[PDB]
Design a protein around this ligand. Structure first.
Ligand code: FMN
Ligand code: FMN
Ligand code: NA
Ligand code: NA
Lengths: 150, 150
């Protein structure tokens, strides 16, 4: 399958600082079988150029361990009247200090739409966040991912 | 443990129609071990009066089955600068047609706060939604839950 078109458009590209962005719930499963979440943004989510796969860069330690243990993940993405629910299977990964760069195949996509306009989770980017989430290293890892995938 | 105070305040009460409300990501795990999500609101989430436990009413079929299979769940709740991540263990349930009324113990709470103001997922209630999610039956089930818990 592929990254759904509307989701590729929601995630593609990287924000500058001081800009309103959607926070995407990035889901995993912990060792007791409980669902687990982290917030990611366009900075840590990028489709491949052909949209076949979804790349992610994850800093949060428990999410990273969950991915290493089960290889399963999911995403919530909000766009207009649609809540997109994704399920993701990790097919490869690359570690760089506290960051895990991941390649995901989409294994399921549900368009959850009741005809009711939705607002996404939102936050404003900042120079502090750029430091907390190590944007320079995330960017580098995404280019390493792009290069290896191709 | 108990329902965290800030989360009890976010969930308590029931909205009328045509009102802006937060949509809470309600998480489960499916049969292949993938995280799974549904959107719920204050209409389908209510703390016990003593805040010891969290009641929920779930209509979405796969979420309901996931709960029946694993008894695990989670929640995302947004409040100011804090993203609240909850993990939930189902301790009892009651079925009424297509609805599953659930009692959850909180097994974990993480306050995820980077000092960056957050906007929750939002939607406006409506008479159609009241019908789609069967508010009269949800309300009844919550009173049945309150009664049995006490
Ligand atoms: C606005 C905001 C942005 C965040 N961005 C990221 C991010 O890009 N990468 C990340 O790993 N965690 C990020 N987080 C933090 C995760 O949501 C948080 O660490 C979560 O509890 C997951 O941590 P854990 O997997 O170690 O439990 C962000 C949090 C907020 C509030
Ligand atoms: C605005 C909005 C409100 C919703 N409210 C509810 C709800 O109260 N209860 C519910 O079970 N599903 C609700 N949903 C639908 C779930 O998010 C959706 O069915 C999801 O795909 C879970 O279905 P599944 O568990 O069968 O896969 C809502 C969807 C939207 C867009
Ligand atoms: Na991106
Ligand atoms: Na409520």
């Amino acid at each position: 399958s592929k990254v759904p078109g509307e989701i590729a458009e929601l995630l593609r590209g990287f924000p500058d600082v001081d800009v309103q962005e959607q926070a995407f719930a990035f889901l995993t499963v912990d060792t007791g079988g409980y669902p687990h979440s982290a917030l990611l943004s366009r900075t840590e989510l990028e489709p491949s150029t052909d949209e076949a796969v979804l790349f992610a860069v994850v800093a949060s330690p428990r999410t990273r361990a969950n991915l290493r243990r089960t290889g399963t993940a999911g995403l919530i993405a909000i766009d207009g009247t649609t809540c997109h629910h994704l399920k993701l299977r990790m097919t490869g990964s690359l570690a760089d200090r506290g960051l895990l760069a991941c390649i995901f195949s989409v294994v399921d996509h549900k368009r959850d739409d009741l005809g009711i306009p939705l607002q996404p989770m939102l936050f404003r980017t900042s120079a502090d966040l750029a430091e907390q989430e190590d944007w320079p290293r995330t960017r580098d890892l995404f280019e390493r991912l792009r290069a290896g995938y191709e």
